[PDB]
Amino acid sequence: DDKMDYDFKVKLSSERERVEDLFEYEGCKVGRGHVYKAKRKDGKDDKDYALKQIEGTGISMSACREIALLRELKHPNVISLQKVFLSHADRKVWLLFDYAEHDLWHIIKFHRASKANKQLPRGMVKSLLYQILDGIHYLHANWVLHRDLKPANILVMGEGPERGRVKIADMGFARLFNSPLKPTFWYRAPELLLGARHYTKAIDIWAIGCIFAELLTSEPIFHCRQTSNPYHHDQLDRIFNVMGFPADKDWEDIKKMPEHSTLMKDFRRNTYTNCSLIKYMEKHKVKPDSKAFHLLQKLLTMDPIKRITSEQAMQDPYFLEDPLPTSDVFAGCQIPYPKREFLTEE
Amino acid sequence: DKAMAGNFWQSSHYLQWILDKQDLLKERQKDLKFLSEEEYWKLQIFFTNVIQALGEHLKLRQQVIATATVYFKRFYARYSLKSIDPVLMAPTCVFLASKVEEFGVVSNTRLIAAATSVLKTRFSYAFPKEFPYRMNHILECEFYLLELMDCCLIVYHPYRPLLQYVQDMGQEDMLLPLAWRIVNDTYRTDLCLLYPPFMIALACLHVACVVQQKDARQWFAELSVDMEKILEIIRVILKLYEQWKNFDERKEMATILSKMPKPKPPP
Numbered sequence: 001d002d003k004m005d006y007d008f009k010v011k012l013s014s015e016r017e018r019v020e021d022l023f024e025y026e027g028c029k030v031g032r033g034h035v036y037k038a039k040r041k042d043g044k045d046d047k048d049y050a051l052k053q054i055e056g057t058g059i060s061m062s063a064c065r066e067i068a069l070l071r072e073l074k075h076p077n078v079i080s081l082q083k084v085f086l087s088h089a090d091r092k093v094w095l096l097f098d099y100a101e102h103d104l105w106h107i108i109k110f111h112r113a114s115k116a117n118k119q120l121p122r123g124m125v126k127s128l129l130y131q132i133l134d135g136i137h138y139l140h141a142n143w144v145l146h147r148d149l150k151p152a153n154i155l156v157m158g159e160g161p162e163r164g165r166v167k168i169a170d171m172g173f174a175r176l177f178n179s180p181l182k183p184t185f186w187y188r189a190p191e192l193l194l195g196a197r198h199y200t201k202a203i204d205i206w207a208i209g210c211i212f213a214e215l216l217t218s219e220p221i222f223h224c225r226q227t228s229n230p231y232h233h234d235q236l237d238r239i240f241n242v243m244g245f246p247a248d249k250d251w252e253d254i255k256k257m258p259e260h261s262t263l264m265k266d267f268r269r270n271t272y273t274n275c276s277l278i279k280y281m282e283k284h285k286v287k288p289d290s291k292a293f294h295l296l297q298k299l300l301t302m303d304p305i306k307r308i309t310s311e312q313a314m315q316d317p318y319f320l321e322d323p324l325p326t327s328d329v330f331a332g333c334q335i336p337y338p339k340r341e342f343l344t345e346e
Numbered sequence: 347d348k349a350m351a352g353n354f355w356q357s358s359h360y361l362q363w364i365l366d367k368q369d370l371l372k373e374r375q376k377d378l379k380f381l382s383e384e385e386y387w388k389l390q391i392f393f394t395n396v397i398q399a400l401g402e403h404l405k406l407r408q409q410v411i412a413t414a415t416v417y418f419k420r421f422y423a424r425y426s427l428k429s430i431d432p433v434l435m436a437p438t439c440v441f442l443a444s445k446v447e448e449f450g451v452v453s454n455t456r457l458i459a460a461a462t463s464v465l466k467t468r469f470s471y472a473f474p475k476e477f478p479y480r481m482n483h484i485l486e487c488e489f490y491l492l493e494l495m496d497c498c499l500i501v502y503h504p505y506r507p508l509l510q511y512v513q514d515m516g517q518e519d520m521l522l523p524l525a526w527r528i529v530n531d532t533y534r535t536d537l538c539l540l541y542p543p544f545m546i547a548l549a550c551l552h553v554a555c556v557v558q559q560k561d562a563r564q565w566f567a568e569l570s571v572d573m574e575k576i577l578e579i580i581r582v583i584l585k586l587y588e589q590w591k592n593f594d595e596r597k598e599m600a601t602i603l604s605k606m607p608k609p610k611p612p613p
């Protein structure tokens with residue numbers, strides 16, 4: 001600005017840390033949902049860092065809220081913002097995080113592919129679920145919803161001081177009026193599909209239920225093929241094929257859901273009479289009398305008010321049954337999952 | 347928005363933005379070469395009122411206006427009034443604070459229109475000329491503000507604990523409107539930079555009880571708090587109202603604004 005003090009302006013400019021001075025990231029793009037795997041340029045760490053360049057320019061509402069909340073949130077199972085760079089020339093924003101080598105999308109994909117080349121370790125499954133719940137419990141206790149939980153967002157740290165620790169990432173930090181109706185459906189709770197007007201803690205817990213099933217079987221439990229409207233017929237059909245159609249007593253307030261009459265129009269209870277979570281999970285070699293299953297069923301409760309909370313899930317006797325969950329989900333064993341490849345595509 | 351509600355003790359507000367009073371006074375000495383101490387606190391009152399008016403024009407809720415006010419105070423707690431024009435900083439603070447919320451957005455045209463309209467209709471005693479800044483200036487200023495604040499955007503305020511305290515008294519109808527109003531008035535001072543918000547709430551509630559002749563002494567005794575620090579806050583509130591009485595901002599602010607140190611231009 002012309003009316004800004006010149007001395008003030010040049011002092012700040014002289015002192016301002018620039019992302020390109022501190023970090024080597026060119027050619028090191030790993031993702032774009034622009035995410036880079038970066039090393040420090042001085043060579044004082046040799047640690048890997050994740051640099052996220054925020055999409056757009058300036059500071060949007062979504063960028064503001066993301067910076068706002070990450071700046072406060074501190075917990076071992078939630079991804080931790082190290083530093084923010086404000087690039088004054090191009091008005092671009094960069095976020096620095098510790099680098100998580102793995103995630104559940106890739107880990108599960110690796111096991112699903114290994115099944116073809118003929119299961120996920122059960123101590124690992126439990127430990128992952130425990131840490132996901134711990135991190136989500138922390139967010140929820142602070143009235144922060146994730147609003148977009150899926151395997152790609154459950155990161156897992158590689159070799160280093162936090163080996164095998166879960167890091168929840170990529171929270172949906174801005175949703176206009178906390179609304180799903182404003183601009184994959186596999187991890188979406190049935191109330192969202194029937195037109196729920198707000199995100200809730202319960203919606204996050206359903207997604208954890210979905211992830212947990214997927215870790216146990218290597219298959220997305222509510223897998224389905226790929227608008228403004230919340231009602232998705234094929235996704236609901238898949239839920240009922242797995243779960244059965246809910247009885248009136250299972251979800252009394254279903255009648256209040258905005259899409260209830262559409263549900264009645266398109267679906268018949270009779271269609272799903274041979275369908276249940278018990279039957280589904282048995283086919284995938286998970287016993288219905290297992291503590292794992294009983295907890296899974298409490299997470300995948302259809303009526304959101306009857307869904308277990310994160311804190312209650314952490315207290316489940318499943319976590320007291322042998323084997324105990326471990327802080328490193330790999331339990332000191334060798335990590336077979338491949339590292340992320342650098343992308344060279346234009 | 348209850349995001350981070352019970353996290354004050356591990357918050358950036360508490361760990362980074364509760365300042366030492368002597369560090370505040372030391373940094374203020376550079377602007378005290380131009381303005382007296384009286385004139386400096388009068389300027390603070392003026393820009394608190396400017397921010398309030400901008401927020402009311404944009405129909406923002408009190409808590410958003412308070413956050414914006416805290417941003418403004420944090421900036422000038424570190425930096426001279428010459429560094430960035432406070433006329434530019436004030437709407438920039440409101441704009442940034444509104445973006446921390448996800449319930450509605452403040453557009454560019456609406457922000458500038460609001461700055462233009464509020465200064466000409468409510469502050470022409472201080473500003474004969476039209477609001478000269480365009481949206482590119484706001485966006486530039488926003489980057490400087492965010493940098494100075496070390497990206498600390500979540501701000502806690504006395505409104506939430508006040509509401510809890512009065513509901514605990516069973517005296518919401520009698521005491522809340524006055525106590526709330528007094529909380530608004532504390533932003534005319536440095537209190538928000540110096541004390542946890544719940545302590546400021548307790549002080550405002552005390553003053554409200556004294557003004558309305560309500561005996562709440564036993565209720566205050568039932569709390570586990572440092573009442574010395576509460577009394578410190580009470581004294582600043584009582585002083586604020588005497589300052590208010592003796593200050594005519596409408597007659598004085600044009601002259602006071604002319605004494606503000608002016609930005610060094612480029613060479």
Ligand SMILES: C[C@H](O)c1c(Cl)cncc1-c1cnc2c(c1)CCCN2C(N)=O
Pocket residue numbers: 030031032035050052079097098099100101103105152153155169170340
């Ligand atoms: C920014 C991101 O949240 C992230 C962070 Cl803070 C830290 N370490 C790794 C990552 C990260 C990189 N890449 C991918 C993912 C995660 C998810 C799975 C998809 N993905 C790719 N590269 O495909």
